[PDB]
Design a protein around this ligand. Structure first.
Ligand SMILES: CC(=O)N[C@@H]1[C@@H](O)[C@H](O[C@@H]2O[C@H](CO)[C@H](O)[C@H](O)[C@H]2O)[C@@H](CO)O[C@H]1O
Ligand SMILES: [Ca+2]
Ligand SMILES: [Cl-]
Length: 219
């Protein structure tokens, strides 16, 4: 039985394009008995530990080509400044070597059918999906950390590749929450999907990602 998660409904004027992003500090234990912080492994971390170093940035309308694979860095145990893809509407360089990111909003299928998602993580990616898994319809800011058991849990090195299948409907916006951490050095945040009856994967979310107003009525 393919999973069939709950979605949301909204009048078009209450809909805007793209996801919300918040960026959080994630320090090294030390910079110039390993150097990187193992905190990200604690089970309380994705629920509330991820905020305890404070945040440093946010953006909105995050759309299109949101994945990356940064494997060019030469040095470990050291903060390295680099830019996010332009999909993030976030101009400043970040400590790509060590940071945490949460992306939330809604995935809207273009056709009713079965979707397969594929994620590849360095270091850590969590995938929550559905009004009863990610967050409440039209109440994203209040319920953002009330997510359920993960639909996918990818951690480098040993659990770094994951996939999942969900059956989805044209007329519904599905709450979606993507948690990413880099503890150190190289950074990979790859979230792709296969639409229904489609053999080739895509990493372009353009036309699929939306935000609804936080009215709180289930819309
Ligand atoms: C070339 C090499 O082996 N460099 C090592 C790093 O692998 C290692 O850091 C880890 O790198 C992996 C990717 O392979 C991953 O991104 C981890 O997050 C990261 O900690 C590092 C140990 O601190 O030493 C480098 O020299
Ligand atoms: Ca890493
Ligand atoms: Cl659900």
């Amino acid at each position: 039985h393919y999973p069939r998660p709950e979605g949301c409904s909204s009048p078009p004027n209450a809909v805007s394009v793209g996801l919300h992003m918040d960026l959080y500090n994630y320090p090294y234990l030390y910079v110039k008995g390993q150097c990187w912080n193992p905190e990200y492994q604690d089970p309380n971390f994705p629920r509330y530990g991820y905020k305890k170093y404070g945040s440093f940035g946010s953006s909105d309308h995050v759309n299109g080509k949101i994945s990356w694979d940064h494997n060019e860095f030469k040095e470990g145990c050291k903060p390295i400044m680099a830019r996010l893809p332009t999909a993030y509407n976030y101009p400043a360089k970040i400590t790509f070597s060590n940071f945490t990111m949460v992306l939330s909003g809604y995935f809207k299928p273009k056709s009713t059918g079965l979707y397969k998602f594929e994620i590849h993580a360095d270091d850590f990616i969590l995938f929550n999906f559905g009004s009863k898994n990610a967050f409440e319809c039209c109440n994203r800011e209040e319920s953002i950390d009330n997510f359920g058991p993960y639909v996918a849990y990818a951690m480098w090195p040993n659990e770094a590749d994951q996939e999942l299948e969900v059956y989805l409907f044209e007329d519904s916006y599905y709450p979606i929450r993507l948690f990413y951490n880099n503890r150190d050095y190289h950074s990979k945040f790859m979230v792709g999907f296969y639409p229904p009856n489609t053999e080739e994967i895509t990493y372009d979310f353009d036309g699929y990602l939306y935000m609804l107003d936080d009215t709180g009525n289930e819309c």
